[PDB]
Amino acid sequence: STGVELYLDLLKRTVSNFIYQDATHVAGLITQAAFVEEARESGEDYPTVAHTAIGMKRLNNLQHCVESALRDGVPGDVLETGVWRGGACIFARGILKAYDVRDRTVWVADSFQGFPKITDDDHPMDAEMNLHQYNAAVDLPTSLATVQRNFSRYGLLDDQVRFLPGWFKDTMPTAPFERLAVLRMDGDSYGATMDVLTHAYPRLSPGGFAIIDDYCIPACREAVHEYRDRHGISDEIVEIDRQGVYWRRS
Amino acid sequence: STGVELYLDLLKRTVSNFIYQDATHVAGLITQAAFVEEARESGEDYPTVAHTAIGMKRLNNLQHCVESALRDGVPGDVLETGVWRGGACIFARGILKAYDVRDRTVWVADSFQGFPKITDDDHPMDAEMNLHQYNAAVDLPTSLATVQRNFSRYGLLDDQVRFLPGWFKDTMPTAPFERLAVLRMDGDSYGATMDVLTHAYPRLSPGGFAIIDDYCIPACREAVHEYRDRHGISDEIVEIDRQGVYWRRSA
Ligand SMILES: CC[C@H]1OC(=O)/C=C/[C@H](C)[C@@H](O[C@@H]2O[C@H](C)C[C@H](N(C)C)[C@H]2O)[C@@H](C)C[C@@H](C)C(=O)/C=C/C=C/[C@@H]1CO[C@@H]1O[C@H](C)[C@@H](O)[C@@H](O)[C@H]1OC
Ligand SMILES: CC[C@H]1OC(=O)/C=C/[C@H](C)[C@@H](O[C@@H]2O[C@H](C)C[C@H](N(C)C)[C@H]2O)[C@@H](C)C[C@@H](C)C(=O)/C=C/C=C/[C@@H]1CO[C@@H]1O[C@H](C)[C@@H](O)[C@@H](O)[C@H]1OC
Ligand SMILES: Nc1ncnc2c1ncn2[C@@H]1O[C@H](CSCC[C@H](N)C(=O)O)[C@@H](O)[C@H]1O
Ligand SMILES: Nc1ncnc2c1ncn2[C@@H]1O[C@H](CSCC[C@H](N)C(=O)O)[C@@H](O)[C@H]1O
Ligand SMILES: [Mg+2]
Ligand SMILES: [Mg+2]
Ligand SMILES: [Mg+2]
Ligand SMILES: [Mg+2]
Ligand SMILES: [Mg+2]
């Protein structure tokens, strides 16, 4: 009902393309191209056009986490690791824009090349799963220039959006952010999840949020539990939908 | 900057599909399917997907007219005659929503089946132009159910949106609105333009806005001048882009 509420609601419907309802790619457990409302609502399909695949439930979660951090004065930036066409990061920048927040940045981290080719340095679960095999099938490889273009279409490409192009094992250890209020992990594999927990989670502020988009994937879950056990983290894992979970760092 | 400004800016980019940049139909003077920014900015193409064809310049004009009416206390509702997929009316309802206006309605008037077949009763300029020829080529026929569906996708289908299905010569004389603050005419022909000026313009409040979307079309322009001459209307005709004009009613 307020201007902010209307803007953020529309931005969610737009980045997920509930407006025009694009077909999905046929891959994984999706056997037909037709737009299905329930699949887009819960982020389960592979949009041919939409700027995010995370769906409405995970967009609502991202809004909750960012708004809570702002409300509670939790310091730091927003980082997404694994951005595809950029829609979740566009939405995050839009939240900051709606509240006229000028002192936080959205960090946009990706290979900008899709999933990595498997080698003998990969975890066996990642090697077996071989996510790389799906790159073309779901149009995953999306260049930095394309993602920048997408931000610009919403009027949200500015100096509060910064990009971290490369493999997370290479980009995360020396990424230039000092503090995070929201760490959103969407890289699917054991490797991508462990890379980012290892190298970015220590910069997550107390009261900040750690979102695991791909917790339904066994390899991803494996990394989450290994990392939490190592660090003695017992913060409640709260389920969002059939894919994602999050916790709030105590 | 403000939530309202951000919402309405996004709503314009969305109904015109600057976000996903759908191809155009190849028709009229548009010779290629590719999205062209300048063509969508000025409302010159025939979107395959977008909910409005009027473009950013005419969306900005609609915003200016509605906001001015609200600011100045001009009484009445908003009517668009010729809505296609509904996007300009969706945007109008969004403007009212952004300002929490609860006492005005957006009236959505169309045949919901494209241009009418020409008959012997048509003006000779309309007969020659024969807009009916283009219906399928640019996917013009769009049912009431489809337009309602489109409103719902934005969360804007509610009791402040009312529909007037049928030919304007049938629906306008007894349309139930009492007063208009904005009258947006987008029916292309002499006939549709004269139908709406004849039967809806008298309900346009002083200080209200009359928008002629299709003024570049000779038959439409003919109707505009005939009507203005008949009624002694000399309110300045202000050009928006390469298609549309508007005036503000002084009397
Ligand atoms: C198509 C791409 C996708 O691929 C699959 O969806 C693969 C699915 C396999 C076919 C599945 O196997 C089948 O299950 C059946 C129940 C039984 C079958 N049989 C034994 C006969 C068996 O063949 C699955 C369960 C295999 C397991 C290991 C799995 O969870 C894999 C995930 C892959 C995700 C990838 C990557 O998409 C990512 O996904 C996460 C969850 C999203 O947020 C998002 O980031 C998205 O990126 C855009
Ligand atoms: C394809 C549908 C469209 O068709 C045309 O765009 C036809 C164009 C003709 C080809 C044109 O002719 C050409 O001009 C050249 C200058 C010279 C050419 N040659 C002699 C060399 C001649 O061939 C035009 C100028 C003909 C004149 C009579 C005209 O203005 C017709 C309008 C028809 C509009 C219709 C209906 O679309 C409506 O359009 C108005 C302007 C929009 O807001 C919108 O509501 C839209 O609905 C969605
Ligand atoms: N090790 C790694 N390093 C960098 N990027 C990676 C990676 N493994 C996967 N990726 C990227 O992780 C993404 C997974 S899909 C991300 C979906 C996105 N958050 C949305 O809103 O739709 C892809 O863009 C892929 O290129
Ligand atoms: N005589 C008549 N009566 C009712 N509707 C008519 C008509 N002549 C044309 N129309 C309608 O006028 C419209 C012209 S195109 C309208 C474009 C629309 N305003 C937009 O925002 O894109 C079509 O939807 C067509 O069905
Ligand atoms: Mg090796
Ligand atoms: Mg690795
Ligand atoms: Mg994911
Ligand atoms: Mg007639
Ligand atoms: Mg027109």
Swiss-Prot record, chain A:
Metabolic or biological pathway: Antibiotic biosynthesis; mycinamicin biosynthesis
Null allele phenotype: No production of mycinamicin II and accumulation of mycinamicin III.
InterPro entries: SAM-dependent_MTases_sf (IPR029063), TylF_MeTrfase (IPR008884)
Required cofactor names: Mg(2+)
UniProt GO BP: antibiotic biosynthetic process; methylation
List of residues binding Mg(2+): 186, 213-214
Chain residues that bind S-adenosyl-L-methionine: 52-53, 80-84, 110-114, 168, 186-187
EC nos: 2.1.1.237
An example molecular function term from Gene Ontology annotations: magnesium ion binding
Catalytic activity: mycinamicin III + S-adenosyl-L-methionine = mycinamicin IV + S-adenosyl-L-homocysteine + H(+)
The keyword Isomerase appears for this protein: no
Keyword annotations of the record: Antibiotic biosynthesis, Magnesium, Metal-binding, Methyltransferase, S-adenosyl-L-methionine, Transferase
Role this protein plays: O-methyltransferase that catalyzes the conversion of mycinamicin III to mycinamicin IV in the biosynthesis of mycinamicin, a 16-membered macrolide antibiotic.
Family: Belongs to the methyltransferase TylF/MycF family.
PANTHER family attached to this UniProt entry: MACROCIN O-METHYLTRANSFERASE
Name listed for the protein in its UniProt record: Mycinamicin III 3''-O-methyltransferase
Record organism: Micromonospora griseorubida
